[PDB]
Amino acid sequence: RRVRISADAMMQALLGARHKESLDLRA
Amino acid sequence: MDDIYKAAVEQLTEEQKNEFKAAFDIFVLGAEDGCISTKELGKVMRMLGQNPTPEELQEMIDEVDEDGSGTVDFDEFLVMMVRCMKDDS
Ligand SMILES: [Ca+2]
C-alpha cells in the first residue's frame, strides 16, 4: 500500500530508459 | 525457480544489459569493493528526497535478497531490475 518509487522515479534517477513520460499507465 | 530469470536475462539484448550494467557501476559510487549496500541505497534515496530509517533499508534488501545477506551484488541487481520491470507486464 502506498508503495514508493514504483520504477519511474528510479529510471529518472539514472540513465536506464527514458520511457518517455510513462510506460503503460494512462495519464 | 530462478530459471525464469535466466531465460529472461538470456533473451535480453547486449545493449539492454550494458545499460543496466552501467547503472550498477554508478550505484556502487559509494562502495569501493564494488558491492551495493544500504549506504549506497541511502545515498540514492537521499537524492530522490527520501530519508527513511536505516532499519527499513535493511528490511528492503532482505525482501529482494533471498540469502538475506543484507547486500546486493551484480547478479542480484540484475534479477531485481528484471523483476521490477516484469512486475508491470
Ligand atoms: Ca544477497
Give B15 Cα–ligand 1 centroid separation in angstroms: 25
User: Structure solved using which method?
Assistant: NMR
**DSSP-assigned states of every residue in B55-70:** HHHHHHHHHH-SS--S
Q: How far is CA B51 from the centre of its chain?
A: 18
Please report where in the chains the cell 542480484 appears, as a residue. Answer: B76
**DSSP-assigned states of every residue in A1-27:** ---S--SHHHHHHSSS---TT-SS---
CB B86 within 8 A of CB B9: no
Q: What is the total count of domains within chain A?
A: 1
CB contact under 8 A, B48 and A6: no
Smallest CA–CA distance, residue A18 to chain B, in Å, is 12
Q: Is residue B77 classed as helix, strand or coil in its secondary structure?
A: helix
Domain that holds residue A13: 1-27
B84 backbone dihedrals φ, ψ, rounded to 5°: -65, -40
Binding positions of B for Ca(2+) are 65, 67, 69, 71, 76
Domain that holds residue B36: 1-89
Q: What is the total count of domains within chain B?
A: 1
Nearest CA among B28, B23, B31 for reference residue A17: B23
| Distance from the first to the final alpha carbon of chain B | 19
Alpha-carbon span B59 to B52, nearest angstrom: 12
**How is residue B69 written as a grid cell?**
545477506
**How is residue B32 written as a grid cell?**
569501493
